[PDB]
Amino acid sequence: GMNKMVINHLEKLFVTNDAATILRELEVQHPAAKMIVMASHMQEQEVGD
Amino acid sequence: LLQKGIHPTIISESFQKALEKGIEILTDMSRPVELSDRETLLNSATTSLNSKVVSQYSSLLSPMSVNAVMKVIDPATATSVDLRDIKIVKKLGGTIDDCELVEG
Amino acid sequence: LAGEGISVNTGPKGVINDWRRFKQLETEQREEQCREMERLIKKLSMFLQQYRKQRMEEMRQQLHKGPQFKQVFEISSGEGFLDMIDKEQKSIVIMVHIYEDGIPGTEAMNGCMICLAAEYPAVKFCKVKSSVIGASSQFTRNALPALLIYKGGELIGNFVRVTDQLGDDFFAVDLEAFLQEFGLLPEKEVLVLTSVRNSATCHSEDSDLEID
Amino acid sequence: AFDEYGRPFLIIKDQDRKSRLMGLEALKSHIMAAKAVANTMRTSLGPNGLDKMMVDKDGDVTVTNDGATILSMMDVDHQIAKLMVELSKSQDDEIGDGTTGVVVLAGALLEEAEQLLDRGIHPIRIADGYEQAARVAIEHLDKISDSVLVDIKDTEPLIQTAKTTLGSKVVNSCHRQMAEIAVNAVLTVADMERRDVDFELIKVEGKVGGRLEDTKLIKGVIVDKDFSHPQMPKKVEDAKIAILTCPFEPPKPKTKHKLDVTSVEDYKALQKYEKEKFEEMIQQIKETGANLAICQWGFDDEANHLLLQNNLPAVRWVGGPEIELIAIATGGRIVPRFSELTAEKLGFAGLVQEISFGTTKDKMLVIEQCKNSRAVTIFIRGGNKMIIEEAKRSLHDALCVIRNLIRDNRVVYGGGAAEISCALAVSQEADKCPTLEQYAMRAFADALEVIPMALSENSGMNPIQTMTEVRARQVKEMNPALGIDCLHKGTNDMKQQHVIETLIGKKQQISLATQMVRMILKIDDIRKP
Amino acid sequence: PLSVFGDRSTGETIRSQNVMAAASIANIVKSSLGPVGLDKMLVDDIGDVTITNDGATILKLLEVEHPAAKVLCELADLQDKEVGDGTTSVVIIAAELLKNADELVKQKIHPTSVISGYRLACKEAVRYINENLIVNTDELGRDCLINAAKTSMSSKIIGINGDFFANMVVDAVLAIKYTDIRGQPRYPVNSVNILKAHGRSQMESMLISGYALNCVVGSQGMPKRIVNAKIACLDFSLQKTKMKLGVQVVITDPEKLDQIRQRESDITKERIQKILATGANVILTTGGIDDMCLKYFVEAGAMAVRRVLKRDLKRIAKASGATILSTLANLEGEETFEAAMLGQAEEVVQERICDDELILIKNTKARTSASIILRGANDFMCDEMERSLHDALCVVKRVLESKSVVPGGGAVEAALSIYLENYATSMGSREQLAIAEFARSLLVIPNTLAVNAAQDSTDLVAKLRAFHNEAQVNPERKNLKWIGLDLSNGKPRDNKQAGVFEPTIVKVKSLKFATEAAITILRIDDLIKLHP
Amino acid sequence: MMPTPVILLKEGTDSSQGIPQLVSNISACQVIAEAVRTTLGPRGMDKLIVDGRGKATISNDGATILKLLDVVHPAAKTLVDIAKSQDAEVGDGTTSVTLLAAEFLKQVKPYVEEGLHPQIIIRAFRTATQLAVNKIKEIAVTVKKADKVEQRKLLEKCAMTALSSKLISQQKAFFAKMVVDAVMMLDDLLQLKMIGIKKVQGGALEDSQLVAGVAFKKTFSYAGFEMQPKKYHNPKIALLNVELELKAEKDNAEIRVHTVEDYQAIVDAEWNILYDKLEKIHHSGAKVVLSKLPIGDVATQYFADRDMFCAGRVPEEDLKRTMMACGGSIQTSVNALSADVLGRCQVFEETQIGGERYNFFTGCPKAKTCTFILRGGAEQFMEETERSLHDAIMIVRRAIKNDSVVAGGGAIEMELSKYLRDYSRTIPGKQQLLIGAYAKALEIIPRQLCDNAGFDATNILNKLRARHAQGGTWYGVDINNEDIADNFEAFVWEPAMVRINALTAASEAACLIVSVDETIKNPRSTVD
Numbered sequence A: 001g002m003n004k005m006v007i008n009h010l011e012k013l014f015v016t017n018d019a020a021t022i023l024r025e026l027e028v029q030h031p032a033a034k035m036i037v038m039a040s041h042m043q044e045q046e047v048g049d
Numbered sequence B: 001l002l003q004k005g006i007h008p009t010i011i012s013e014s015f016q017k018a019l020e021k022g023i024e025i026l027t028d029m030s031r032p033v034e035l036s037d038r039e040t041l042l043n044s045a046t047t048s049l050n051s052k053v054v055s056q057y058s059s060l061l062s063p064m065s066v067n068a069v070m071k072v073i074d075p076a077t078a079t080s081v082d083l084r085d086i087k088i089v090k091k092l093g094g095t096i097d098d099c100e101l102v103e104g
Numbered sequence C: 001l002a003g004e005g006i007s008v009n010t011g012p013k014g015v016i017n018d019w020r021r022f023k024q025l026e027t028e029q030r031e032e033q034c035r036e037m038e039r040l041i042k043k044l045s046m047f048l049q050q051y052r053k054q055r056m057e058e059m060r061q062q063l064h065k066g067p068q069f070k071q072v073f074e075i076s077s078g079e080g081f082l083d084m085i086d087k088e089q090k091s092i093v094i095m096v097h098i099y100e101d102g103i104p105g106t107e108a109m110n111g112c113m114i115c116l117a118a119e120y121p122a123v124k125f126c127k128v129k130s131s132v133i134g135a136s137s138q139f140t141r142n143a144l145p146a147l148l149i150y151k152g153g154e155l156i157g158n159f160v161r162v163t164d165q166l167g168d169d170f171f172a173v174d175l176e177a178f179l180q181e182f183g184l185l186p187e188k189e190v191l192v193l194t195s196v197r198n199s200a201t202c203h204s205e206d207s208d209l210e211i212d
Numbered sequence D: 001a002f003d004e005y006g007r008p009f010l011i012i013k014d015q016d017r018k019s020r021l022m023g024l025e026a027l028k029s030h031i032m033a034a035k036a037v038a039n040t041m042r043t044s045l046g047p048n049g050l051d052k053m054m055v056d057k058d059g060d061v062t063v064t065n066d067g068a069t070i071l072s073m074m075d076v077d078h079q080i081a082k083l084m085v086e087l088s089k090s091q092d093d094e095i096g097d098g099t100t101g102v103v104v105l106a107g108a109l110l111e112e113a114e115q116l117l118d119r120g121i122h123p124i125r126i127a128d129g130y131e132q133a134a135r136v137a138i139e140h141l142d143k144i145s146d147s148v149l150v151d152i153k154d155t156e157p158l159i160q161t162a163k164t165t166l167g168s169k170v171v172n173s174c175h176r177q178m179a180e181i182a183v184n185a186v187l188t189v190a191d192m193e194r195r196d197v198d199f200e201l202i203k204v205e206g207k208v209g210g211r212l213e214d215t216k217l218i219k220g221v222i223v224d225k226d227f228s229h230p231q232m233p234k235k236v237e238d239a240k241i242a243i244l245t246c247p248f249e250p251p252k253p254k255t256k257h258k259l260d261v262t263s264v265e266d267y268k269a270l271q272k273y274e275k276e277k278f279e280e281m282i283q284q285i286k287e288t289g290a291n292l293a294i295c296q297w298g299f300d301d302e303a304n305h306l307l308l309q310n311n312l313p314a315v316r317w318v319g320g321p322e323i324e325l326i327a328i329a330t331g332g333r334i335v336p337r338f339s340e341l342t343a344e345k346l347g348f349a350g351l352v353q354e355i356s357f358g359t360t361k362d363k364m365l366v367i368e369q370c371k372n373s374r375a376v377t378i379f380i381r382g383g384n385k386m387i388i389e390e391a392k393r394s395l396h397d398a399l400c401v402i403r404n405l406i407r408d409n410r411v412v413y414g415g416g417a418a419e420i421s422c423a424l425a426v427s428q429e430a431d432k433c434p435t436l437e438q439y440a441m442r443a444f445a446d447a448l449e450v451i452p453m454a455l456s457e458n459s460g461m462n463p464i465q466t467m468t469e470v471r472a473r474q475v476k477e478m479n480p481a482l483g484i485d486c487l488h489k490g491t492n493d494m495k496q497q498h499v500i501e502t503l504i505g506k507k508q509q510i511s512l513a514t515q516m517v518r519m520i521l522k523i524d525d526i527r528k529p
Numbered sequence E: 001p002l003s004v005f006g007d008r009s010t011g012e013t014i015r016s017q018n019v020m021a022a023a024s025i026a027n028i029v030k031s032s033l034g035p036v037g038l039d040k041m042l043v044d045d046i047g048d049v050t051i052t053n054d055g056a057t058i059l060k061l062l063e064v065e066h067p068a069a070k071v072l073c074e075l076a077d078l079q080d081k082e083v084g085d086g087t088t089s090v091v092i093i094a095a096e097l098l099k100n101a102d103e104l105v106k107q108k109i110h111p112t113s114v115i116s117g118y119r120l121a122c123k124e125a126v127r128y129i130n131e132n133l134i135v136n137t138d139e140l141g142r143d144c145l146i147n148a149a150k151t152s153m154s155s156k157i158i159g160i161n162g163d164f165f166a167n168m169v170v171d172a173v174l175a176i177k178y179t180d181i182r183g184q185p186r187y188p189v190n191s192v193n194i195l196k197a198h199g200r201s202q203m204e205s206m207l208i209s210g211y212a213l214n215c216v217v218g219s220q221g222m223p224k225r226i227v228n229a230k231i232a233c234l235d236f237s238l239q240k241t242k243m244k245l246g247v248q249v250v251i252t253d254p255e256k257l258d259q260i261r262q263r264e265s266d267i268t269k270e271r272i273q274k275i276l277a278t279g280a281n282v283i284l285t286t287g288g289i290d291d292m293c294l295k296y297f298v299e300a301g302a303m304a305v306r307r308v309l310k311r312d313l314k315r316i317a318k319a320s321g322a323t324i325l326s327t328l329a330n331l332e333g334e335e336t337f338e339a340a341m342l343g344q345a346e347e348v349v350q351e352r353i354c355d356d357e358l359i360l361i362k363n364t365k366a367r368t369s370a371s372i373i374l375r376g377a378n379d380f381m382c383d384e385m386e387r388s389l390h391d392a393l394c395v396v397k398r399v400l401e402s403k404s405v406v407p408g409g410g411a412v413e414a415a416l417s418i419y420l421e422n423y424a425t426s427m428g429s430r431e432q433l434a435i436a437e438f439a440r441s442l443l444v445i446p447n448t449l450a451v452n453a454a455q456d457s458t459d460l461v462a463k464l465r466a467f468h469n470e471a472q473v474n475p476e477r478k479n480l481k482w483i484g485l486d487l488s489n490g491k492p493r494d495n496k497q498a499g500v501f502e503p504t505i506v507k508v509k510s511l512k513f514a515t516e517a518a519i520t521i522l523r524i525d526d527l528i529k530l531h532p
Numbered sequence F: 001m002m003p004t005p006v007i008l009l010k011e012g013t014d015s016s017q018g019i020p021q022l023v024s025n026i027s028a029c030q031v032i033a034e035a036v037r038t039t040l041g042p043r044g045m046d047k048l049i050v051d052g053r054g055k056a057t058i059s060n061d062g063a064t065i066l067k068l069l070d071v072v073h074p075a076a077k078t079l080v081d082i083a084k085s086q087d088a089e090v091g092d093g094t095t096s097v098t099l100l101a102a103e104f105l106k107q108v109k110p111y112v113e114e115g116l117h118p119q120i121i122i123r124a125f126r127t128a129t130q131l132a133v134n135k136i137k138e139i140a141v142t143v144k145k146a147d148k149v150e151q152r153k154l155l156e157k158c159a160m161t162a163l164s165s166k167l168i169s170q171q172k173a174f175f176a177k178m179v180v181d182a183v184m185m186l187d188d189l190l191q192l193k194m195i196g197i198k199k200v201q202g203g204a205l206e207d208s209q210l211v212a213g214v215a216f217k218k219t220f221s222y223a224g225f226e227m228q229p230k231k232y233h234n235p236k237i238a239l240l241n242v243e244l245e246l247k248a249e250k251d252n253a254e255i256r257v258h259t260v261e262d263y264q265a266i267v268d269a270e271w272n273i274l275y276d277k278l279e280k281i282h283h284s285g286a287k288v289v290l291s292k293l294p295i296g297d298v299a300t301q302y303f304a305d306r307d308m309f310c311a312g313r314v315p316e317e318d319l320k321r322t323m324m325a326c327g328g329s330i331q332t333s334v335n336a337l338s339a340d341v342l343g344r345c346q347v348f349e350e351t352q353i354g355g356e357r358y359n360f361f362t363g364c365p366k367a368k369t370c371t372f373i374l375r376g377g378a379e380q381f382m383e384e385t386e387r388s389l390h391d392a393i394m395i396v397r398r399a400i401k402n403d404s405v406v407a408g409g410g411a412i413e414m415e416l417s418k419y420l421r422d423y424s425r426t427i428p429g430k431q432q433l434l435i436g437a438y439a440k441a442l443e444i445i446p447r448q449l450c451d452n453a454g455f456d457a458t459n460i461l462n463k464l465r466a467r468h469a470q471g472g473t474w475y476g477v478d479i480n481n482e483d484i485a486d487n488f489e490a491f492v493w494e495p496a497m498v499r500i501n502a503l504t505a506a507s508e509a510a511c512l513i514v515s516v517d518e519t520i521k522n523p524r525s526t527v528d
């Protein structure tokens, strides 16, 4: 996997290949994608990978 | 010179004196040349073209220029060359290696 | 206070850069503004007759062309207006429309211009916003519909308040007749539709010969 | 650039509004700006130099010749001009004199470095050559220096040095008087064992009116305040001063304190207590035999009238530094409260007087005729405040020069003689070095020769001819004291003309100019927003 | 100090800017190289759509500001004009040459030395190509032309249908063959009229053994088919004879006005009768024909075509043997029209092509002509077919004129790179670096071809270089000079036996043009942009 | 692209993906390196940066220049971060890390353009960096003699090499000697806070001095201070954290009395409290009193009457340095001022330095501190002198930790390039190209040295390569002689850890930059 440079709204730079971190730092607006992101976050909290 | 307190008229006369002396020196260093010597003309043309973008093409352009000048004047009894007699035609396409010396 | 005779001398020649920096922008500014002085201010301050042929004129004006019908060109900025207006030649006739959204009369004559451009290829119909043109706000109230016509840098059409002279439901026939009876619209020509296209280019003259 | 793929290309925040100068063009711009500053300064060099008349942001006008002051008040925006200002200020703080010579020398050095760079020499090599030539010049200055006596028994060399320092200023009308008062002020307050001269013990202050010739040195303290009660005498002789830092008011605890009055007896006791405290403090002051009382925090009407009634002149609201100076001069201790006041803590002064200043209603107190006053004050009079400020800074320059003489007693003869000799030594040394640094050393010598040229230009003489003649005479007859006869006295021997400059000043000038020129030559990029 | 009203860039800054502009122009079209290249498509401000693969067309359509980028765009235009193929490879090579030359310059190598090295490298590359990498087409036959056309049409909209389009192209080119003085056969391409019309699929494109006009008969009265056509070509209008500007009619006796008015059209009537009396059947004119003359032609059962394009009329007259007539005036001062100036054809029809009609002049005598009607799905597709067809025609013309071809798929580039890398060590001291960089930059073509196919570019180019190095070092295995790139499978392949050819003139001209453009850009080391 | 009535990401989000993104990242890194290229080597040049407020910073250190550059490119900030890392861990080499990282990226750019997989490049970089670090550790020259004079000379040479690129390079021997002397009298932690650095405007560079003790500026003397003696020959220093002046006993303290006798008693009690504190100080035998808290005018006059020196509001750092020099203990209470907690120095004296008064504590025989008093003609001059001395101090500390040095001037990197190329010649060939690119990129530093000096870098590099190929490990660049020379014999020494950290950080930065494939930039909230 390839690392992704993500700049959030506060100009804090994240470079990582962790899906949960990328989704967290992405300003997702489509609510269906929001639901999928929430499922991914729940997976991160429950297991960690 | 001016910062040292020299009036800008002594400077002019001194420069005139230096110019006259330098002209004399340059004339002393000179060497006579005759138009029948093609080698010196070719060398002068090549030296002129050395500093331009066509320097790589000098082996073609220098004889071209020498021939162009010698074909529009009389080698004997000629004190000037009228460059209006050498018409230059610019045609796009090809390379500089395709330059020609059409005599018509 | 004495020394009125100043003779600023070296000053202006040592400050040419910045003064010319202002001067070029000012030149653009009043060139653009004077390109619309000649319209602004003074305009706003100032049974064959039953048209039997009008219906059939609309009938064969419906058949615009084959490949769609395009649209009317829109000017983005005043600089764009200037750099599209100073180009081309005198033979090109340009009609320009100032408009705003929602106000009456714009849609009808916009469609009229669309179909006219469809059946008058030579002309260069185009439309520009009132905000884009930067005209006086007096125009922005009471001078929006203005069938403005240009021809190679000089005015040839002087038409504003076209709603009064045409109405609100006026169709292509009405505006076309109104423009042609002022001697503005060029004479139409019989134009046919080829297959699609023939002329790719004509640059090389190596065509044919039969030398022995 | 915006990338070869057409995508946005942003690197530095707000890079569109920023500017950058790269390489040798930036160095040329710096050299030209520094040359402009130095050529502005060079007109105010020497006895014939002309003053610059500076106006601040509020319209206040300052007519001055001090280079450091001129550059400090100059509103510059270029960074190299700020570097010149800082260089002049540094020369001022370290020495106090020669703040104009450093700027001219740096400008000449950068001007020569410009034509050295034009011929293809790396600026680091120019800086190295300048450093070598500066070392040679400093060693030559040490070689050709001369020593003077710095004893109080004979002050002629000190007076001559102070006169040389003050020659370029406007106070040259009172030249010898100003030199003498500066020398006496420095020598009266100084630690003779080559230690420091505490400038905080020299109170320099001036008052408008009178004449510039009326400036005098007081071997005591002059105070702006006057006697509190208008009916006390204006003259006190053989005063036994009692310096106090406690206001003549009933005592008050610093801690938050409430005093509760619960009955008529308590009120009567409080009133009697206040009255007795006033009387007790006055009697305590009187018991020491003091003639004059000096307070720092003022006092109220009861204390004032008791002081008047007991023939005790007094002054209130004397400043803290003023209290310190009075205590030092009069040889008396500072007493924090009356209960600790004894006769042994009293100061002495032969005369305490109140001074009038014409039709101005302003009064000033002078304390003088002390026994062995270690603190002095300089009272400057003038026709306007501008010449008063100029006299203040000129006297400060003289005091700094005499302080430098206290620190080191080696002098060299000014008027361009030292610079010409240093240039000759540098040129002689450059003839033996490998030719690569020879150009830099010769350029340094040429830059050193700008001071005599500027002196001759300001004095109206032809620069190049006079400088060449003086240099030829210096080479012919080995007299390194021959300089530029700026005053047209008819001779060139500055040793005979008594034009004397401290060696430390010249060494600091050369060193500071060399380091600043090196730093400027080492800068190649600028990134102003 | 300068006090020039403008902006100035000097030194490495302007060189980097020029390299950036050239690299941007290269990267614009770098994705459209080789059979795995994909077409681009451009939308103008008005809304016009142009789907294209030709680099020259793409660079012409784009609006460009930077002068060096304009230089590369004009270089592509020149390559298109003087060759007709390789307009993308020349741009890519020029940009890579500029990039590598600037990389050398950044290492404190003087630009003059780099320019001299590039000049020598170009000369030696041309010499090596002409001496080793050319294949004569005499022994290959028509298959050489077919393979060259197929290679040219690869990466185009007509790539897969090459098996048929190459046959059509070769037939069209051979149809317009003519020999001139000095006995040199000549192939005047652009004399093949390319007609587009949406409709049926690509395979329904027709090659006309004659000529095709995008014109129709002026009136519905005339027949739309004539068997034994007698074509008469005229360069003047057939209208009522209005007198010239210098002639004015003034009537003082009213009895002559009617005679004047009658003669005003009787003149044209007599001219048309003279034209028709010789037996002419088809009449083509560049000028207009009004209703009276159209009726005159209708009554005689002939064809009249008006507003015929001048080039089309010239081609028709030359093919059919007819002569263009500005006036019907002979050397005796009267009006005549002899039969010796009538053209002939075996049939003239007005075919219907997708709800539209065009005139077909089939099987002209005394000379064989050709025309191509392209049928596509829509206008954009037909335009792309026309561009690709023109490229193929130019390639076939170059192959037939100069009988030397070179293997494709980057074989020439790899061979040149290896040879120049070996040869650089024998020339100069600092020119060798320039020659080596020239050789390296020549490798951009196979790298781009491999990249566009999503193949391992590094391994493929390494294998190609190893093959060519072994060919050049082993005198008994010279047959490996033809090893190119097989993009379908991503493996090296003998392109000479695989029928992947292209004219040598393409490579030579592209190399010379790219070298001269890189030299021109490299000379700049300072920019003064005067403010408008 | 389609409108997609409900968009997925926030409006204005900017994204870049693929090879062009990585190429743009490499170009940005090259641009960043170009800003500090010229500040490398003895012939380096200073850079001037002006902030928004207008303050100008003149510097040669790469980390300072990069920090002053407000870089916002996400890939370019990696170079700034690794420069900061090199400054923090080592202190020298902030330019070298950026140059090496940018050169690595530039060398692998052509391979990235032809679609090479980034993971292969990353693996090649890791292997090459590990091999280079091992080679540096193997060939680093160390002496197992533990000689005092030899290690002093080694530290001096390392400091001279670390200083011969700044504006103090003319007096590099003098400054290096002072730096070594200062470091050698630190006990075990080598804390930077234990080496004071004071900058005084005005004076030549050679006038800068190192104080074998502590020295600090005069701090707002009150009235009566000028009557105190300013020189002592065996003073006892009382280090205090105490406010010696009349004030409220406590913030919340309140006094309630109903008798004038109690009022007078309270006033006398306050005065007696202060006087008892002063008597306790006096009876301790101390002659110099130093307090962190303000000292009032009453206490100043009291000490003047007893012929003592007092200085209130002394900063924490200066008080700690004085404690470590004289050898006392800061007392928050004066109730037990035994002789154990009293500092002692040979000579105390107040002198004038460049128009300012500085208190001097000298003659401390067991001092563990220093105080650099730097003189210069400008504030930025002194700031850059402090920066250069800081670099030298860090270098000397690292050399004190271990005496492992390699010859500078590019010799070490030329040897590393030769070794890496030789290693790459014996591997399959996909990694061979990348390792050869790494070795070629290792040549940037000598080339940059020659370019800054004005040489012809090509000839010098050719001669260095020929010399290293035939043997000779420590041949670098002779700047003065326009040629090459054995830099180890020329005493161009640097600690091996400097180059080890430089290589490690540059490799990590290059791998991090190459690993990134997509850049996403969310719109910034609160545009204001």
Ligand SMILES: Nc1ncnc2c1ncn2[C@@H]1O[C@H](COP(=O)(O)OP(=O)(O)O)[C@@H](O)[C@H]1O
Pocket: D044, D045, D046, D047, D049, D067, D097, D098, D099, D100, D101, D164, D165, D166, D167, D168, D169, D413, D414, D415, D416, D455, D483, D484, D485, D486, D487, D499, D501
């Ligand atoms: N009487 C004099 N004769 C000749 N030169 C003098 C005389 N007095 C002063 N100078 C010269 O004038 C120069 C300028 O001195 P001054 O203006 O007082 O301070 P600064 O050196 O800061 O300009 C000194 O270098 C000194 O050598």
Ligand SMILES: Nc1ncnc2c1ncn2[C@@H]1O[C@H](COP(=O)(O)OP(=O)(O)O)[C@@H](O)[C@H]1O
Pocket: E032, E033, E034, E035, E037, E053, E054, E055, E085, E086, E087, E088, E089, E090, E151, E152, E154, E155, E407, E408, E409, E410, E449, E484, E485, E486, E487, E500, E502
């Ligand atoms: N079938 C094929 N197999 C391998 N290579 C080919 C094939 N067809 C064309 N090529 C190569 O692809 C390259 C790109 O040609 P192309 O881009 O279509 O021409 P242009 O540069 O005029 O657009 C040519 O140099 C040619 O050698």
Ligand SMILES: Nc1ncnc2c1ncn2[C@@H]1O[C@H](COP(=O)(O)OP(=O)(O)O)[C@@H](O)[C@H]1O
Pocket: F039, F040, F041, F042, F044, F062, F092, F093, F094, F095, F096, F161, F162, F164, F165, F408, F409, F410, F445, F449, F476, F477, F478, F479, F492
């Ligand atoms: N006398 C010298 N001769 C040759 N090279 C030197 C000399 N002194 C230092 N260097 C080189 O300068 C480089 C360090 O430059 P400098 O700017 O001081 O620190 P940085 O490593 O941060 O660039 C080292 O790589 C060293 O090899």
Ligand SMILES: [Mg+2]
Pocket: D097, D098, D164, D165, D168
């Ligand atoms: Mg002076």
Ligand SMILES: [Mg+2]
Pocket: E085, E086, E152, E391
């Ligand atoms: Mg092609």
Ligand SMILES: [Mg+2]
Pocket: F092, F093, F162, F165, F391
């Ligand atoms: Mg360093």
